[PDB]
């Protein structure tokens, strides 16, 4: 299933300002998280704003969203696990690996 090792999913991170604001918009309460929590809130964010395509729900559109500015892409496929993590890492600092 997941293309990301479980151990990496437990990496402790400190999101940068903009990403932090995005997570807090959906309930996030901390300054540091594990990647698993970052991915949880990010999912809630996309689900809530309905950024995914209705017909092909793995396609996410973000050209007119803060998420687009954060990922540097107009859209992406949820199926590209490694690519999503890579885009996420540029918006945070790794605390403990």
């Amino acid at each position: 299933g997941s293309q990301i090792p479980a151990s990496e999913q437990e990496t402790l991170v400190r999101p940068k300002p903009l990403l932090l604001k995005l997570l807090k918009s959906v309930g996030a309460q901390k300054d540091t998280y594990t990647m698993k929590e970052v991915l949880f809130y990010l999912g809630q964010y996309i689900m809530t704003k309905r950024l995914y395509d209705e017909k092909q729900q793995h396609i996410v559109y973000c050209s007119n969203d803060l998420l687009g500015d954060l990922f540097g892409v107009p859209s992406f496929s949820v199926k590209e696990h490694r690519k999503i993590y890579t885009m996420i890492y540029r918006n945070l600092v790794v605390v403990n690996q």
Partner: peptide
Amino acid sequence: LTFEHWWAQLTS
């Protein structure tokens, strides 16, 4: 097929 189905696969 749903967004959450696909999204849930990223996490083990």
